[PDB]
């Protein structure tokens, strides 16, 4: 079964799934901006339930919320959104690339003792028992790595996650930075005995060389083109380039290892931030209805079959998260 924020759910009840999205999200530091950018709970609930309804209208029955522990993750809010709409939501346990922000805590602990075991205990507890005393369990572990390497600090989390994966069977989803380190993540996690049929290497659409994807897929893992709609921001490809690589890989029989998502943020934490005019095109399709309305029909137009589409959007998530 999949562990969702409203309880366990049968694999066959997951339905069409978006496997990497952010219902709410804050970059590390947002909490320090609380005076002028506090959480507007009513406004967030309204906006997020509206979005959940739009997804349910499109046949989407489950979303995997990939928000790390230090980026504003809020299981009780996700449960409110789920209970209000019927949309099934899985949440994550993990911390963001370091790299990234809010890293000083476990880096310091690592310097003074066995941080891997501490991380392992957090992950295990949040997967098996619950988060922050609420009884809401994480349904996926979230890992992230930097662009130029999986750093020794980041590896603490990879080794702790592999251990929890061996003991519980929990799925693992990842973040890759600027289209790098996919093969290394897959190789590291598999070498540690993690189950490749429960690993989704993320942000693989960030690289436009099919050979990079094929190398990752070699480890038996799945890969997600999960920032679909985010176009030419800070090195991201366009969707057209994404789909060009995807059609190639589909044509090589990889449909049962490919997944699709947006990495969208439905409500931003902190003060609202205005998108500069020049950047509007990059973010225009970066929202969770884009795959349903624009992408899937475009793949069908291209000769991708209904069976293949259902494999990416329903078959694979059932197997990976269920
Ligand atoms: Co990410
Ligand atoms: Co993300």
TrEMBL record:
Keywords: Hydrolase, Metal-binding, Zinc
Taxonomy, superkingdom: Bacteria
Binding site for Zn(2+) 2: 142, 175, 203
Cofactor(s) required for function per UniProt: a divalent metal cation
PROSITE patterns (UniProt xref): PHOSPHOTRIESTERASE_1, PHOSPHOTRIESTERASE_2
Residues annotated for Zn(2+) 1 binding in this entry: 20, 22, 142, 263
Keyword Metal-binding attached: yes
Modified residues (N6-carboxylysine): 142
Cofactor, free-text remark: Binds 2 divalent metal cations per subunit.
Pfam families linked to this entry: PTE (PF02126)
Keyword presence, Zinc: yes
Molecular functions (GO terms): lactonohydrolase activity; zinc ion binding
Family as reported in the entry's similarity comment: Belongs to the metallo-dependent hydrolases superfamily. Phosphotriesterase family.
Protein name: Phosphotriesterase, putative
Provenance organism: Deinococcus radiodurans (strain ATCC 13939 / DSM 20539 / JCM 16871 / CCUG 27074 / LMG 4051 / NBRC 15346 / NCIMB 9279 / VKM B-1422 / R1)
